[PDB]
Amino acid sequence: KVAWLRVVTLAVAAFIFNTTEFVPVGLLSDIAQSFHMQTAQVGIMLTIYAWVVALMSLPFMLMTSQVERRKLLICLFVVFIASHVLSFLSWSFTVLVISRIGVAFANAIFWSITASLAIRMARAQALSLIATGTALAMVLGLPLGRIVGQYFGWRMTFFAIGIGALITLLCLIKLLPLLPLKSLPLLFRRPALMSIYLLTVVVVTAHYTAYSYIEPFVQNIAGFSANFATALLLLLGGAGIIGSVIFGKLGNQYASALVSTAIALLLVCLALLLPAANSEIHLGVLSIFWGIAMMIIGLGMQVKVLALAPDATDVAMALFSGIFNIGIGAGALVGNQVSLHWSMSMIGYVGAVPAFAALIWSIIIFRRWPVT
Ligand SMILES: CCCCCCCCCO[C@@H]1O[C@H](CO)[C@@H](O)[C@H](O)[C@H]1O
Ligand SMILES: CCCCCCCCCO[C@@H]1O[C@H](CO)[C@@H](O)[C@H](O)[C@H]1O
């Protein structure tokens, strides 16, 4: 009953925390406009947010292992809210980026403890309540947040996100009850696990070289309307939900085959992004594949990480999330460079290189370790 109420207030927080990671992709120009930059330069806020989560997610999780979670959640929420107020009234791109380092700290801690808190209250579908909040962040959180950005501006988008957290924080204060390192070398010494981390960083770099700049790409390269970009992002968000269900149905026994097929499919979408940019329905139909491909890739490797480190899922997850974010920041940076020094239309072809590498690498490591 109220058990459900608290797992539910956890899911709305998941949705809120994931939406703010996502929304900069759909406010890049709006943000660029307010600070007089080209849209690609704004990509630095993505790199910098993702690398701070990466370098901190494993350290943060350890240092906060002895803190009771209700006290922990409140502090991370306070940091989160304060940071979004700071994004709203930020007086320089530098101040905006500094606010984004603040939200990165809260996110890093927040994803440490949120699955554990979901299972503590009654369980398997208590966990799916946290995932569906992520899911909603994808198909609703990012698209709606862009629409708010277009009407009210990007600052109000960040301001609204913090207010929602604040409302969520208060529900958590009423609803929450009292909530009372040596694995790295062993995990390092598992080449099958290390190979998945390697795969993860390469393939995520591939995807985010293009995905980070899809908004300026759609409007300034494909030259479609601002509202076409918003629809594409809902397609991608809904395509991700689609990929999420096929994986959930066949992932436990076809994860390797699913991962490599999805990587092949992602490679193909990257290479055909600029060619498909002349037809709005080609881009829209491409993005449906793109969205399906990338979410199957991400969950397949997450399931490999679990299958390879059941003895230490916490640090393995902290490691997986960390290296996943390194690929996020690398994708934005490479995308940033291809856009500034070459052009944003090669964004699809440059992302294709590492996606190809990752394909071959996936094909190799699944031959070498085929039973999980
Ligand atoms: C080419 C070397 C092989 C790389 C394979 C990646 C697994 C080892 C990297 O772990 C490191 O752990 C640190 C924890 O703070 C972070 O800096 C970041 O998570 C990550 O880099
Ligand atoms: C952070 C992105 C910059 C790194 C460059 C991406 C390449 C990493 C892919 O791995 C390598 O691809 C080789 C191609 O020959 C394979 O032969 C080799 O097996 C494998 O080690």
Whole-number Cα distances in Å, 15 to 131, 137, 143, 230, 301: 9, 5, 13, 19, 22
Helix (H, G, I), strand (E, B) or coil at 129: helix
Q: How is residue 122 annotated by DSSP?
A: -
What's the CA gap between 54 and 104, in Å, rounded?
Answer: 9
Report domain extents, the chain: 1-368
- Residue reference for tokens 């660029």: 32
Which ranges constitute the DSSP H helices of the chain?
Answer: 2-22, 28-35, 39-42, 44-63, 69-88, 93-120, 124-136, 142-152, 154-175, 183-188, 191-211, 214-216, 226-276, 280-308, 313-337, 347-368
The burial of 92, by beta-carbon neighbours within 10 Å (0-12 exposed, 13-18 middle, 19 or more buried), is given as: exposed
What's the CA gap between 295 and 134, in Å, rounded?
Answer: 12
Residue of 197, 201, 361, 366 with the most ligand 2 atoms within 8 Å of its CB, for mutation: 361
What's the CA gap between 320 and 315, in Å, rounded?
Answer: 8
What's the CA gap between 255 and 248, in Å, rounded?
Answer: 10
* Residues 29, 31, 34, 35, CA torsion sign: negative
Which one of the ligands is nearest to 365 CA? 2
- Residue reference for tokens 């139909």: 285
Q: How is residue 312 annotated by DSSP?
A: G
What's the CA gap between 78 and 169, in Å, rounded?
Answer: 8
Torsion region of 153: left, alpha or beta (phi above 0 gives left; psi -120 to 50 gives alpha): left
Closest C-alpha residue for ligand 2 atom 11: 357
Dihedral through CA 274, CA 280, CA 284, CA 290, nearest 10? Answer: 0
> Could you tell me the distance, in angstroms and rounded to a whole number, from the CA of residue 297 to the centre of ligand 2?
18
Dihedral through CA 338, CA 342, CA 343, CA 348, nearest 10? Answer: -50
What's the CA gap between 298 and 131, in Å, rounded?
Answer: 13
Resolution in A: 2.7
CA angle, 220 as apex, 215 and 224 as ends, to 5°?
80
Closest C-alpha residue for ligand 1 atom 12: 319
What's the CA gap between 221 and 273, in Å, rounded?
Answer: 11
